[PDB]
């Protein structure tokens, strides 16, 4: 549980911020 949202949501954070302003921009 605890490591699971570590390792998938606690490790890529610049990952969503660059696919949001990809697809908000291109």
Same mark, same amino acid.
């Given at each position: $549980? &605890?490591g699971? !949202? /570590? *390792? !998938?949501?606690?490790? $890529? /954070?610049?990952?969503?911020?660059?696919? &949001? *302003?990809? *697809?908000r @921009? @291109?």
């Amino acid at each position: $549980g &605890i490591g699971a !949202v /570590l *390792k !998938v949501l606690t490790t $890529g /954070l610049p990952a969503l911020i660059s696919w &949001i *302003k990809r *697809k908000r @921009q @291109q």
